[PDB]
Amino acid sequence: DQVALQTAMELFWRQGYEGTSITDLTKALGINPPSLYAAFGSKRDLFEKTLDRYMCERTLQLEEAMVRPTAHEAVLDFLTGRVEVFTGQPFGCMTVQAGLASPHHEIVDLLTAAREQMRQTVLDRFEKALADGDLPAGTDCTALARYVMAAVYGLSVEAASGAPREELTAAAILAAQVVPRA
Amino acid sequence: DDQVALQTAMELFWRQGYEGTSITDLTKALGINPPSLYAAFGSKRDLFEKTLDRYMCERTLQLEEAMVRPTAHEAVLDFLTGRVEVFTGCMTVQAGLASGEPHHEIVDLLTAAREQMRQTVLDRFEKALADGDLPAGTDCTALARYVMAAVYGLSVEAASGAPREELTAAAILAAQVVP
Ligand SMILES: O=[N+]([O-])c1ccc(O)cc1
Numbered sequence: 001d002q003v004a005l006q007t008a009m010e011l012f013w014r015q016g017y018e019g020t021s022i023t024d025l026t027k028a029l030g031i032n033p034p035s036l037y038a039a040f041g042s043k044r045d046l047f048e049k050t051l052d053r054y055m056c057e058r059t060l061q062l063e064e065a066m067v068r069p070t071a072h073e074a075v076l077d078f079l080t081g082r083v084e085v086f087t088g089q090p091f092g093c094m095t096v097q098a099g100l101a102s103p104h105h106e107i108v109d110l111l112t113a114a115r116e117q118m119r120q121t122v123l124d125r126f127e128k129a130l131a132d133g134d135l136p137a138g139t140d141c142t143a144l145a146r147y148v149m150a151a152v153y154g155l156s157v158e159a160a161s162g163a164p165r166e167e168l169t170a171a172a173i174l175a176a177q178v179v180p181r182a
Numbered sequence: 183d184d185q186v187a188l189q190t191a192m193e194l195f196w197r198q199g200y201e202g203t204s205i206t207d208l209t210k211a212l213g214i215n216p217p218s219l220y221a222a223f224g225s226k227r228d229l230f231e232k233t234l235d236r237y238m239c240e241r242t243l244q245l246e247e248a249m250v251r252p253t254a255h256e257a258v259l260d261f262l263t264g265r266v267e268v269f270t271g272c273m274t275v276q277a278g279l280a281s282g283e284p285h286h287e288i289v290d291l292l293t294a295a296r297e298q299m300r301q302t303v304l305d306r307f308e309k310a311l312a313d314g315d316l317p318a319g320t321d322c323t324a325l326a327r328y329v330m331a332a333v334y335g336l337s338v339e340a341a342s343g344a345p346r347e348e349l350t351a352a353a354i355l356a357a358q359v360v361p
Binding site: 009010013014090091092095096097098099100101102103115140142143144146147149150151152153154155156157158160161163167168170171174175177178 | 192237271273275276279280327330331332333334336337339344349351352355356358359
């Protein structure tokens with residue numbers, strides 16, 4: 001379910017992956033080890049499902065978005081897809097959470113890596129778009145990557161605060177407009 | 183310093199809220215005696231206001247000042263760039279993985295501030311749509327939601343360590359969607 005993933009998130013957030021036991025998860029979830037396995041799989045399966053739910057910078061979805069034929073469509077796809085994932089979840093995504101005053105160091109390391117891989121993946125997309133010519137020459141790619149990152153996290157914050165989904169989707173469509181299509 | 187004292191104060195207020203927090207709670211959490219608390223921060227009220235001013239993303243006074251610019255675009259532009267000028271980690275959300283449940287006092291306060299900010303931008307847009315600078319058809323509701331996302335996202339980027347010059351450039355880009 002959905003409270004189950006939140007429960008798993010809090011544990012992994014505080015303890016990290018390595019230091020979270022099956023026994024921690026069964027106790028927190030209130031189900032036995034075979035039922036945890038039947039519902040969520042191995043601890044690793046459960047951890048990857050938790051990251052699907054709470055990570056802005058999820059690799060597979062970013063990569064799937066980058067395959068679109070223009071940088072604009074790539075970013076558009078990505079931003080609207082995130083809005084689907086983000087929508088009522090009150091914590092925001094994990095980077096939003098890590099940015100608050102007062103995560104386990106393993107989780108800090110994970111977010112730090114994921115954020116920079118996202119930035120670089122977007123920059124690689126921008127580099128290809130300049131060669132293909134759908135990004136105008138002289139585009140500040142570094143600035144534009146940072147803006148895309150700001151847009152994702154900002155849409156996460158709005159979702160977390162309870163913004164209506166059609167309104168947030170309209171906002172993501174406006175945000176994508178900043179990535180030009182020449 | 184005691185940038186950190188205010189961090190610890192914020193943690194206690196987040197949990198207990200204002201009314202149920204005593205000086206005796208604060209002194210035992212900050213590890214400092216009340217005269218010291220009075221010298222450094224003032225009354226419980228002053229300390230509360232100080233801690234809120236440190237950690238709230240919504241800066242209404244500087245927002246309202248930005249709105250007095252004659253175009254919707256210029257208003258947003260000066261608000262966004264101005265916001266980055268301050269940033270260089272606020273309570274962007276009303277829930278904490280680590281911190282536990284926020285007191286209902288804190289939830290209400292954060293909700294009101296968010297809503298004030300949104301209304302202020304939405305008004306300015308509605309003003310601008312009549313005054314002529316926003317094209318009729320413009321979705322002012324979606325456009326205000328976008329501005330909120332930009333301001334909080336730039337806030338998250340800044341909190342995560344983004345370089346100043348990149349963030350300023352990102353703000354200027356973000357202002358471009360207000361026609
Ligand atoms: O310097 N950079 O390019 C950065 C710095 C910090 C950060 O969180 C992301 C990117």
